[PDB]
Design a binder for this molecule. Structure first.
Ligand SMILES: *[C@@H]1O[C@H](CO)[C@@H](O[C@@H]2O[C@H](CO)[C@@H](O)[C@H](O)[C@H]2NC(C)=O)[C@H](O)[C@H]1NC(C)=O
Ligand SMILES: Nc1ncnc2[nH]cnc12
Length: 246
């Protein structure tokens, strides 16, 4: 398990949580010196439990699938919640079995459904440590519309940050003031799968991408990532989605 307390949290204790979250995800191989996540994991070992604690010390346990960093559900008090999709339904067989009741949310977990349910594209939803403390708080009591927005916050803070050092740094900058994500944050979120595959394909292709990945940069404009010498590859991405899952 890993853990994070919003109470007293600063850029460094968050950095330390995001480190632990990365280091909880098993791998047997590194590709260009980036942990390569497993094809699959059987049984309960598939699921990492994150204990998040709001500013007041109230808590939720989030279940994360260690092959893709995908959040499947969480436990609030004696109620478990899960996204409405086959992979979360599977997870429900392994985690939080002692919850008094299980609610299945009325959406799946992908950004497009969550945004629909939230009424907002995540370009318009502030994130940061304060947004994360709100989200923990929201998810403590079932409200499906408000949960969708909180889950957007939760996914980007925790999973998207473990995936990209850049997104981790963005959150750190938003330690005490939330702010909507940069376009490059959005770009990086939406290319994880694409990058993970091109980095794996570069391995028999002299570091060169079979297909270039188009991002948006820090500056605020469009760029093509064509090989493993890119900053995106050499310092930004921290985890690879195995091509066996793409
Ligand atoms: C790999 O990526 C680098 C960019 O990081 C490419 O080189 C650049 O592209 C052209 C020259 O061919 C110039 O516009 C840039 O200034 C170059 N930058 C640097 C730092 O060299 C390179 O062409 C790519 N290689 C492959 C095989 O795709
Ligand atoms: N549920 C989820 N968990 C992690 N990353 C995601 N990206 C979109 N949805 C996600």
């Amino acid at each position: 398990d890993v853990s994070f307390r919003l109470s007293g949290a600063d850029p460094s204790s968050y950095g330390m949580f995001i480190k632990d979250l990365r280091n909880a995800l098993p791998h047997t191989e590194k590709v260009y010196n980036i942990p390569l996540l497993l094809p699959s994991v059987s049984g309960a070992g598939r699921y990492l439990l994150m204990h998040l604690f709001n500013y007041d010390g109230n808590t939720i346990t989030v279940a994360v699938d260690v092959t893709n960093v995908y959040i499947m559900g969480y436990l609030a008090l004696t109620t478990s919640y899960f996204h409405n999709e086959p992979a979360a339904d599977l997870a429900s067989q392994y985690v939080f079995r002692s919850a008094r009741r299980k609610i299945t949310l009325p959406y799946s977990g992908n950004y497009d459904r969550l945004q629909i349910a939230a009424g907002k594209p995540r370009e318009k939803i502030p994130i940061g440590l304060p947004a994360l403390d709100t989200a923990i708080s929201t998810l403590l009591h079932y409200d499906s519309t408000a949960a969708a927005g909180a889950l957007l916050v939760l996914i980007q803070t925790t999973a998207e940050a473990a995936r990209f050092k850049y997104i981790e740094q963005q959150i750190q900058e938003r330690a005490y003031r939330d702010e909507v994500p940069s376009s490059a944050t959005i770009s990086l979120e939406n290319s994880w799968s694409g990058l993970s595959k091109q980095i794996q394909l570069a391995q028999g292709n002299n570091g060169v991408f079979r297909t270039p990945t188009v991002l948006v940069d820090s500056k605020g404009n469009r760029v093509q990532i064509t090989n493993v010498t890119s900053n995106v590859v050499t310092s930004n991405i921290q985890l690879l989605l195995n091509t066996k899952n793409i």
